[PDB]
Amino acid sequence: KRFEVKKWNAVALWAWDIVVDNCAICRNHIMDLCIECQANQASATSEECTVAWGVCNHAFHFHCISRWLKTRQVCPLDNREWEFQKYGH
Amino acid sequence: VYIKKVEARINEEIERVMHCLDKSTEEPIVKVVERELISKHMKTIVEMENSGLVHMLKNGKTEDLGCMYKLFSRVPNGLKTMCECMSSYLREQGKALVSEEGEGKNPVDYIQGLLDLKSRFDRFLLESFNNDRLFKQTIAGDFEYFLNLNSRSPEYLSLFIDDKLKKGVKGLTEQEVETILDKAMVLFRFMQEKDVFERYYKQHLARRLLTNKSVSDDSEKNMISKLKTECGCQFTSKLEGMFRDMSISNTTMDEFRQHLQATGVSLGGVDLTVRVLTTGYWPTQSATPKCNIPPAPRHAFEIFRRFYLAKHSGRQLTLQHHMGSADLNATTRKHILQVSTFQMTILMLFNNREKYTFEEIQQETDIPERELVRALQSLACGKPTQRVLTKEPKSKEIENGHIFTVNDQFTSKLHRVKIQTVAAKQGESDPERKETRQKVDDDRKHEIEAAIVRIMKSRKKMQHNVLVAEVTQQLKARFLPSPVVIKKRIEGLIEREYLARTPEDRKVYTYVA
Numbered sequence A: 001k002r003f004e005v006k007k008w009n010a011v012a013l014w015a016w017d018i019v020v021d022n023c024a025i026c027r028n029h030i031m032d033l034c035i036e037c038q039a040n041q042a043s044a045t046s047e048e049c050t051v052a053w054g055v056c057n058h059a060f061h062f063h064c065i066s067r068w069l070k071t072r073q074v075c076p077l078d079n080r081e082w083e084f085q086k087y088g089h
Numbered sequence B: 001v002y003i004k005k006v007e008a009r010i011n012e013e014i015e016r017v018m019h020c021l022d023k024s025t026e027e028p029i030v031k032v033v034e035r036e037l038i039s040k041h042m043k044t045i046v047e048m049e050n051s052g053l054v055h056m057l058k059n060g061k062t063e064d065l066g067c068m069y070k071l072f073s074r075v076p077n078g079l080k081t082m083c084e085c086m087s088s089y090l091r092e093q094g095k096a097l098v099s100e101e102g103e104g105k106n107p108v109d110y111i112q113g114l115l116d117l118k119s120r121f122d123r124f125l126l127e128s129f130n131n132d133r134l135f136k137q138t139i140a141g142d143f144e145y146f147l148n149l150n151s152r153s154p155e156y157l158s159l160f161i162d163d164k165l166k167k168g169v170k171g172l173t174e175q176e177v178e179t180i181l182d183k184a185m186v187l188f189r190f191m192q193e194k195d196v197f198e199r200y201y202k203q204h205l206a207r208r209l210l211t212n213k214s215v216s217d218d219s220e221k222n223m224i225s226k227l228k229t230e231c232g233c234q235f236t237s238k239l240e241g242m243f244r245d246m247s248i249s250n251t252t253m254d255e256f257r258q259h260l261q262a263t264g265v266s267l268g269g270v271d272l273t274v275r276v277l278t279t280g281y282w283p284t285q286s287a288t289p290k291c292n293i294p295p296a297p298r299h300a301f302e303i304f305r306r307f308y309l310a311k312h313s314g315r316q317l318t319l320q321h322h323m324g325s326a327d328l329n330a331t332t333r334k335h336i337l338q339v340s341t342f343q344m345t346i347l348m349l350f351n352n353r354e355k356y357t358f359e360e361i362q363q364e365t366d367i368p369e370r371e372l373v374r375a376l377q378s379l380a381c382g383k384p385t386q387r388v389l390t391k392e393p394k395s396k397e398i399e400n401g402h403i404f405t406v407n408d409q410f411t412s413k414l415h416r417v418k419i420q421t422v423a424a425k426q427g428e429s430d431p432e433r434k435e436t437r438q439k440v441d442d443d444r445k446h447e448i449e450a451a452i453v454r455i456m457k458s459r460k461k462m463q464h465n466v467l468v469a470e471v472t473q474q475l476k477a478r479f480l481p482s483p484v485v486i487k488k489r490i491e492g493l494i495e496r497e498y499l500a501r502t503p504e505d506r507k508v509y510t511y512v513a
């Protein structure tokens, strides 16, 4: 051949079993609102109902784990202190 | 020359009064002499014209500044107008420097000039004003007032620090590097809107760590120390977590290579270098791109995906293309090219069959829209005499039916020639600026809500505008209060539980969970 690849420097991103189809706290989805918001509008009045990403690569609705912080303080699928490293998908 | 003359007059008057008159003899004499001379010359001699205060400061006359400071210090309200005029000159210079009208300014040069001006003013202060507190306060206030005039000032500071950190070709030794870093952090001290600064610093960290390594290997840590001491125990810890994640990635990559060497079954896996990162630390590039991966690379990635889905059962190895690089071995000698994971698919298609066009690479490739054209022009359009992908229809604009060819280009004097079309002159185009502005707006939106839900759970309640002052004071060192944004966002939480903050019954808030 005329051109051949010798080295590769790909970067691999990983995500845990967040279950994009069932929120691990509310069991609706990784998007499309939550149990306490339901309808899309539901008198939104600004604020937000996006996805929250932790330091453990877990994803839930911001509302779900914001409320869950009052029940416990360690991400339910593990035993790690939950951070708020990202907001939204 | 008037200041020297009046100083001599004061000296001779005090000498005469202390030698030719009574023992004390000096309080009313010196008071009235000052009130006549300085209190009348103060208003007009420093601002009118013909080498007053602004002109004697612009040219850099240290002795004039020192003697003016030592003379006007005796009379009250002299330092006040001195600092007022100095602040006016500083505002004029900043407006002349922070001017936004006109495109084509180098951010690194702009930050270098601003830091040079700051260092010059600091040197003048130290040499003449004897480190007076009033002058320092006035210059700090002037810097705070004039620096936040533009919203791309922290971005330009981040670009300057990235340029200084990528390679220490200027100032090889450590003393000048330490001094310039101290000056840079001092300049950053009198700056607002720290959120965009942190965001762009993290983006620069991602750019400098996901590219060729061995940039400083110790000055990066010096800079983390500086930011920790300045910004605080906040996001410098998150950058340390990012560095720990990078360490995990490299230690696991070499371990997996060693395990594959023992197996002796790594076919597509040759001299590979796979980095494992976490979603939270590094933002997704645009939309996680996808396209036909060259055969050998594809196999390597599939084996690595098996390794991650089995040992760390759960790690979803998502494929992407807007990151990384590669070394393409071409072949009169064997010169190795370089592809930044963008031209690999197009060149592989060329290897499979030459004489292709835009339609061929847009039909049997399933490649994103614009990042494809960016790589296509990085390969052919606007390329110096090192062309690795030539075309017959020589034109600036990109057509559809254009055939692609290859050239020798013996100008490369080595076997490792790279095409660094990316990371060009800082253009900071409108779409990327708008999207990062929206991202930082959402960042502020969560930053205010997290603070209000973390603080107010252990605090008192507000009636109309009590707790908003506290929440703005807590974020005073972060960014602007944005009263309308916080007012519109605090009233959205009433729709559900956990401190609904009832508007009509604004007398007692639910202190529950």
Ligand SMILES: [Zn+2]
Binding pocket: A023, A024, A025, A026, A027, A028, A029, A034, A035, A060, A061, A064
């Ligand atoms: Zn949920």
Ligand SMILES: [Zn+2]
Binding pocket: A033, A034, A035, A036, A037, A038, A049, A061, A063, A064
């Ligand atoms: Zn919700």
Ligand SMILES: [Zn+2]
Binding pocket: A054, A056, A057, A058, A075, A076, A077, A078, A080
């Ligand atoms: Zn977790």
